[PDB]
Amino acid sequence: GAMGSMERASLIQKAKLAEQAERYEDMAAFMKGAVEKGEELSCEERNLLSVAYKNVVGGQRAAWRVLSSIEQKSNEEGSEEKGPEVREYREKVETELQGVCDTVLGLLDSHLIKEAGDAESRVFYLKMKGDYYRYLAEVATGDDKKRIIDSARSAYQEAMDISKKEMPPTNPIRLGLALNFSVFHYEIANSPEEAISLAKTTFDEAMADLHTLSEDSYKDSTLIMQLLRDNLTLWT
C-alpha cells in the first residue's frame, strides 16, 4: 500500500478534502489506506469509504453501459463491421470495474466484516458486500455468473436478517439495504414481484414507525422512503 507511510488521521482528513474537490478516486485510495491500518471504522469513516467507492464504481458502471450499448448496436443485423475496438474497450472498462469491486470486497473480507459486531456496522458492511457483488453481476456472463448472483443474495440476506432483529424499521441503513436488495431482485435476479413486495412492505413498516422519530431522524428516513416509492412508481 502506497498509503502505508501516512497517518490514519491524515488519510481520513485527505479523504474529506478529496470529497470536497470531487476527486473520488483519490478519496477511495485514502479510505483504502485507512482501512488497511487495521482498526475498526467509525460511523463517519464507514460512510466516507462507501461514498468514495460508490462514486468511483458508479462512473465505471455508467461508462460500461454506454459502451455495452454501442457494442450491441454494432452487432445488430445491418451494421458495418467496426472491428474489435468496441469490444476491446468495453472489456477494458469492465476489467477496471471488476478490479474496483474486488478491491472493495477484499477490504470487507480482510477484515472489516469479521470485526463488525454492532448492527449498524455489520449491516452496513454486508449491504456493501451485496452491492459490490451486484455490480459484478451486472457485467457477468461466464461460468461464475450464478455464483456471483448468489454471493450478492447471501450478503443481502444476512444483512436483512440482522436489520430486522436489531434495527427499527425507519433506520436509514435498514431502509437503504431494503431499497438496494429490492433493486437486486428486479434487475439481477429476475424477481420483479419480490422487488415490489420488499419495497412496499419496507415502506409501509417505516411509515408506521415515523411517529417515534425526531424531526431530523424523520427527514433522514422519509428521504429513503421516497426512493422506495420512486422505484415502486417506476415498476407499477
Binding site: 431499497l179 438496494n180 433493486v183 434487475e187 426512493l227
Partner: peptide, 5 residues
C-alpha cells in the same frame, strides 16, 4: 435506472 443508495 432505479434508485440505490
Amino acid at each position: 435506472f432505479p434508485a440505490t443508495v
